[PDB]
Every structure is written in structure tokens, then in C-alpha cells.
């Protein structure tokens, strides 16, 4: 499978992968916070 | 051929195509009024209107401005074409009509109408060379010649101006 990387640049590849992971993770967290009611239960626990 | 051009095709509105070198033949934007009177333009008192400035000591550069005589002329391909030897002045409405350039390669002096020249910073600073955007330094060698070098006919004025006018279309043509 390695020869797929031939003619690519490792610093482009890691920039593309890194930007995808950052985007995907952030999207997944804001989504998950909406469904799971967390940190909303955390906020309510210590709210005055 | 004696014909300077032929039609592109047989349809009514079609363009013409030059046979030879259009800058030299005078076709398209390089053409001139070929019927124009071959005599000098005259002042109200009947003297020749356009003359080299050495021929009339009444004329001088305005004391703030650079005298261009001596400066190098830079053609469209960024080569030196020559240096300014003399200025020609209009004696009816006092202005510089033509610069006169001694060619750097070869020996001939040719006229160069102002308004085809420009200063590197449009006069504001750094006035140490002249730019001729319209023609290459090789094409300077074929600029039409005045039959005397103290006087210019209306026909010669047209031919010279037409040669530089053609340059933007034809200077880099194959």
C-alpha cells in the first residue's frame, strides 16, 4: 500500500490529515454535547 | 507584389491581411495618410513651424526641468536604442514635438515623437532614461527618415507618427 505515498509530500499529507482530525473532532464534540446533555448536567450540578 | 494587403476571404465584411511587413508597408494601425502634402508646416509669419531647437535660440528648457539631451532611450524589449541628441520645437505653440535620437547600433539619427516617450516615474523623480513602450530597439533602425535634418514635411510627420502607432500591434509580431 505504501507506494500510494509516492509523489506525495509528507508535510502536505500531515497538514491535510491534521486539519481533518481537528475539524472532525470539534464537529463531533459540539454534536455530542447537544445529544448527551453534558456539560449541561455539570453546569447544573454547581450552578448557584 | 505591389499590393500591400489581400482580403482574408471573399465575404463582404472580411478583414485584410498584410502581404509584407505592416510597419514598413503602412497597413492597419501602422498606416499613414499617403496623399498628404510633402511640405513643411508654417507659422503665421511663414517660417518653418517645427525645427531643431539649435535652429532657434529663442527657445530654452524651463529652468526647473531636465534637458533630456544626452539621455539613453530604452526600447520596448528593454534594450538601449540610442541617446537623445536634439529636441525639435513647435514655434506656433511652444512645445517639444520630437526628440532626435542617435542610434546606439549603427550611425543614423531618427526622430521620436513625444507622447510615445515617457519618463520612468512620469517626470516625478529619477529622470535618467527615456522609455519607448511601443517598438523594439531593432525596429528603431527602420524609423522613416526626413529628407532634410533641419525641416520636416507634413507627410514625414505622418509617416514617423504612424510607425510608432503601429508598434503596439506589430512590434512583437512574427
Amino acid at each position: 500500500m505504501h507506494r500510494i505515498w509516492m509523489g506525495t509530500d509528507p508535510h502536505i499529507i500531515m497538514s491535510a490529515l491534521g486539519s481533518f482530525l481537528v475539524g472532525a473532532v470539534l464537529v463531533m464534540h459540539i454534536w455530542a454535547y447537544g445529544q448527551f446533555n453534558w456539560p449541561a448536567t455539570l453546569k447544573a450540578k454547581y450552578a448557584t | 507584389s505591389d499590393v500591400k494587403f489581400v482580403p482574408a476571404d471573399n465575404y463582404n465584411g472580411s478583414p485584410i491581411i498584410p502581404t509584407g511587413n505592416p510597419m514598413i508597408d503602412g497597413v492597419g494601425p501602422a498606416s499613414w495618410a499617403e496623399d498628404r502634402r510633402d511640405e513643411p508646416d508654417l507659422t503665421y509669419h511663414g517660417s518653418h513651424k517645427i525645427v531643431p531647437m539649435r535652429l532657434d535660440p529663442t527657445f530654452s528648457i524651463a529652468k526647473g526641468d531636465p534637458d533630456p539631451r544626452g539621455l539613453p532611450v530604452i526600447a520596448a524589449d528593454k534594450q538601449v536604442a540610442g541617446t537623445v541628441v536634439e529636441l525639435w520645437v513647435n514655434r506656433s505653440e511652444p512645445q517639444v514635438s520630437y526628440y532626435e535620437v542617435q542610434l546606439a547600433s549603427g550611425e543614423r539619427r531618427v526622430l521620436l515623437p513625444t507622447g510615445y516617450v515617457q519618463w520612468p516615474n512620469f517626470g516625478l523623480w529619477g529622470n535618467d532614461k527615456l522609455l519607448v513602450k511601443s517598438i523594439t530597439a531593432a525596429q528603431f533602425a527602420n524609423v522613416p527618415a526626413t529628407k532634410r535634418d533641419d525641416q520636416i514635411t507634413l507627410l514625414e510627420e505622418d509617416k514617423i507618427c504612424a510607425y510608432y502607432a503601429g508598434g503596439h500591434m506589430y512590434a512583437f509580431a512574427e
Binding site: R3, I4, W5 | -
Partner: protein
């Protein structure tokens, strides 16, 4: 441009990093499931 022998070494780390990332995420999901199961 990356060459074939470089691509082997790049691929070796790339696979290793991917597997490490997946393993960490798998533990994260196991924890999340035990905390708040979603099916």
C-alpha cells in the same frame, strides 16, 4: 516528491499512528458507553 523507499518508512509510521489513534478512541467510546449508553 516522496520516493518508494521513503514511502515504506512513511507508511510504517502512518499505520502505527493510525492504530494508536483508533485504540485510544476505542477506550474513549468504552468509557462513554459505560457512562451514558446511547442505544
Amino acid at each position: 516528491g516522496m520516493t518508494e523507499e521513503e514511502a515504506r518508512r512513511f507508511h510504517g509510521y502512518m499505520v502505527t499512528g493510525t492504530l494508536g489513534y483508533v485504540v485510544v478512541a476505542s477506550v474513549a467510546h468504552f468509557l462513554a458507553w459505560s457512562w451514558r449508553p446511547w442505544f
